[PDB]
Amino acid sequence: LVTGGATPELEALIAEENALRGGYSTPQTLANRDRCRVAQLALLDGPFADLGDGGCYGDLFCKALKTYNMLCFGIYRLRDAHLSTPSQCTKRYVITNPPYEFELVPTDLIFCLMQFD
């Protein structure tokens, strides 16, 4: 997940030659691209944006998983978004694996793993 793949083949190559060597394109090379990539996506636009104010994290988790083969392990929520008063602070923080009942606000970002095209 962290180095973007390091299979035993690459670990042998870097142990013998201690550099990445370029390869010609092959069908197995084009198959090795299919693995998920970590992402953030916005909640203010696109198909997920109907989860506005007062939406449930369980609804979002379900619709993302059912329809886009995509699932979320956390919310990158604005620090002051739980306050009543507006604030100019743009700092957010990681909420991990929240309840199905957990409440959304429209200014949010979602951590998820997404498919390859």
């Binding site: 010609y24 998920c36 739980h82």
Partner: protein, 280 residues
């Protein structure tokens, strides 16, 4: 004192299941009064023996020939990273020389020294020899924060064992702590979920069992597509509050073109070796 105190807090945490693995320490310095008090607070689970890891007599004393693994902590704040890496390499060499078939988990400061170490004849990464390279993992975590900011914090909190902490104040800290209370686990999952799609068992597990799956055991597959069917006898990489919750994943049955664009493995982008003045 701090190294042992931090290690024992994570090894003996109440969120793991009822493990009774004894911990034996081997060090060549007599422990100070605060370390002796720390070992007395863990009197039934920790034993200390004074010796050198480079001595086969001491290695036989700590019964390393029957130990389940050997853990080699490193001085992350050392003045000479090269000297620390050399010392850890010597320790690994001595342990492997005494017993080739011992699982060794060690911390390595640099990546070239890790490459130096993995050439040991007894060093078998398949058998379970893990060199946790600090510089590599930290730079990888920083790079994943460049793909999604906050992901270094997200990953780091999944390893440290943490209980739920709750306070009456409505502050960002309450929500943050509630999120921090979850770790990554691993266990085998019910025959009642064999034959279904990975998305389907994920939406089933999510709030009914209260369990989230990131991956399953073509072995290690990060977030499988909807086209993959759950093999019989597989394990799921759950995120959960603790180990005693993920037991449900098992204990359930309807209880309702000559251009070289890439490396040789097809996993990284590549180009011809640019001169330094070209890129300055």
């Amino acid at each position: 004192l701090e190294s042992v105190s931090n290690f024992l807090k994570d090894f003996l945490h109440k969120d793991r299941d009822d493990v009774n693995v004894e911990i034996v320490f081997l060090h060549n310095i007599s422990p100070n009064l605060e370390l002796e008090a720390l070992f007395k607070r863990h009197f039934t689970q920790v034993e200390f023996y004074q010796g050198s890891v480079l001595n086969p007599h001491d290695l036989a004393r700590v019964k390393i020939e029957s130990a389940d693994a050997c853990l080699i902590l490193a001085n992350k704040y050392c003045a000479d990273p090269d000297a620390e890496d050399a010392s850890n390499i010597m320790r690994v060499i001595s342990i492997k020389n005494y017993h080739p078939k011992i699982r060794i988990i060690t911390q390595m400061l640099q990546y070239h020294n890790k490459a130096h170490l993995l050439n040991i004849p007894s060093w078998n990464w398949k058998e379970g020899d893990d060199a946790i390279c600090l510089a590599e993992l930290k730079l990888g975590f920083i790079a994943q924060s460049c793909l999604a900011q906050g992901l270094s914090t997200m990953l780091a909190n999944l390893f440290s064992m943490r209980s739920f902490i709750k306070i009456e104040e409505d502050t960002w800290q309450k929500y943050y702590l509630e999120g921090v209370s979850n770790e990554m686990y691993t266990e085998y999952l019910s025959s009642a979920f064999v034959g279904l799609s990975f998305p389907t068992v994920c939406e089933l597990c999510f709030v009914k069992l209260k369990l989230l799956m990131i991956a399953i055991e073509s072995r290690i597959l990060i977030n499988p597509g909807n086209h993959l069917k759950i093999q019989e006898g597989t394990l799921g990489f759950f995120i959960a509050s603790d180990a005693k919750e993920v037991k449900r994943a098992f204990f359930y049955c309807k209880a309702c073109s000559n251009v070289k664009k890439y490396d040789s493995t097809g996993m990284f982008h590549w180009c011809a070796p640019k001169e330094i003045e070209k890129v300055i």
